[PDB]
Amino acid sequence: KKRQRMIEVQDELLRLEPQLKQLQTKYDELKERKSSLRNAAYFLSNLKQLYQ
Amino acid sequence: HLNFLKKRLLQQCETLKVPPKKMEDLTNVSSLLNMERARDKANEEGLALLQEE
């Protein structure tokens, strides 16, 4: 029964292992996108003010 | 007299009846126990390792 328990715990571990990676990279890329777009909005507004 | 005693005991034990229960050789069983004990110990160790994992 402990050997079966090995089977399910290892299966759960190997299933959950990849799941972290895509979520981590998605969080990182969305945070970078948010920062970049906020900066870009700031610069476009500021340059529009300069032009006006 | 002791030879007569031995032969009467042999006849009594040959005539004696027992239910069909397997009973292994008298000398070796003890050794088996030791091995069996070791087996369990090894098993327990492995069990512990498994649980540890």
From Swiss-Prot, chain A:
Expressed at high levels in the testis, fetal liver, thymus, bone marrow and at lower levels in the lymph nodes, placenta, colon and spleen. Present in all cell lines examined, including B-cells, T-cells, epithelial cells and fibroblast cells. Expressed at high levels in glioblastoma cell lines. It is found in: Cytoplasm; Nucleus; Chromosome, Centromere, Kinetochore. Component of the CENPA-NAC (nucleosome-associated) complex, a complex that plays a central role in assembly of kinetochore proteins, mitotic progression and chromosome segregation. The CENPA-NAC complex recruits the CENPA-CAD (nucleosome distal) complex and may be involved in incorporation of newly synthesized CENPA into centromeres. Plays an important role in the correct PLK1 localization to the mitotic kinetochores. A scaffold protein responsible for the initial recruitment and maintenance of the kinetochore PLK1 population until its degradation. Involved in transcriptional repression. Transmembrane segments: none annotated. It comes from the Eukaryota. It comes from Homo sapiens (Human). Component of the CENPA-NAC complex, at least composed of CENPA, CENPC, CENPH, CENPM, CENPN, CENPT and CENPU. The CENPA-NAC complex interacts with the CENPA-CAD complex, composed of CENPI, CENPK, CENPL, CENPO, CENPP, CENPQ, CENPR and CENPS. Interacts with MLF1. Interacts with PLK1. (Microbial infection) Interacts with the N-terminal domain of Kaposi's sarcoma-associated herpesvirus latent nuclear antigen (LNA). Residues 1-42 form a coiled coil. This is Centromere protein U. Belongs to the CENP-U/AME1 family.
Curated annotation (Swiss-Prot), chain B:
It is found in: Nucleus; Chromosome, Centromere. It comes from the Eukaryota. Disulfide bonds: none annotated. Component of the CENPA-CAD (nucleosome distal) complex, a complex recruited to centromeres which is involved in assembly of kinetochore proteins, mitotic progression and chromosome segregation. May be involved in incorporation of newly synthesized CENPA into centromeres via its interaction with the CENPA-NAC complex. Plays an important role in chromosome congression and in the recruitment of CENP-O complex (which comprises CENPO, CENPP, CENPQ and CENPU), CENPE and PLK1 to the kinetochores. Belongs to the CENP-Q/OKP1 family. Component of the CENPA-CAD complex, composed of CENPI, CENPK, CENPL, CENPO, CENPP, CENPQ, CENPR and CENPS. The CENPA-CAD complex interacts with the CENPA-NAC complex, at least composed of CENPA, CENPC, CENPH, CENPM, CENPN, CENPT and CENPU. This is Centromere protein Q. It comes from Homo sapiens.
